[PDB]
Design a protein around this ligand. Structure first.
Ligand SMILES: [Cu+2]
Length: 129
């Protein structure tokens, strides 16, 4: 499960988020793509050895962040935490973190389902402090 924490954050604030990516197959995870939630504005990422970070501007004036493995990636029995800063929207909302986990064999696990699904997205509730 690719999760993003904290699960609660203040509206309008610049929040430090942490994405946790655990290995769930017997082969390396080589790429993670995270969609920014609606009205959540990506700002900065924390560099990490063995990974390079890039941003993509979707056709809808939205942003994804790609963590690409420059070394071997997340091996079996490993997990990695990625930290970044994003500006929360000023209006309260349920922010969903659609994440896509790329394995070396070409398989992609889509952590995009509802909170009850087998592969759910994690959710941050953004409310006024
Ligand atoms: Cu899982």
């Amino acid at each position: 499960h690719v999760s993003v924490k904290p699960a609660e954050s203040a509206a309008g604030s610049w929040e430090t988020y942490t994405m946790k990516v655990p290995s769930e197959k017997n082969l390396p995870t080589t790429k993670v793509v995270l969609k920014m939630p609606k009205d959540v504005e990506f700002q900065q990422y924390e560099p990490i050895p063995g990974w390079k970070v890039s941003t993509q501007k979707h056709d809808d004036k939205s942003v994804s962040v790609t963590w690409e493995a420059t070394d071997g990636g997340i091996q079996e029995g490993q997990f990695q935490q990625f930290t970044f800063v994003a500006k929360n929207p000023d209006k309260a909302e349920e922010a969903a973190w659609d994440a896509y986990q790329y394995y070396k064999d070409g398989s992609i696990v889509e952590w995009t389902g509802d909170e009850d699904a087998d592969t759910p997205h994690s959710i941050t509730n953004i409310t006024s402090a």
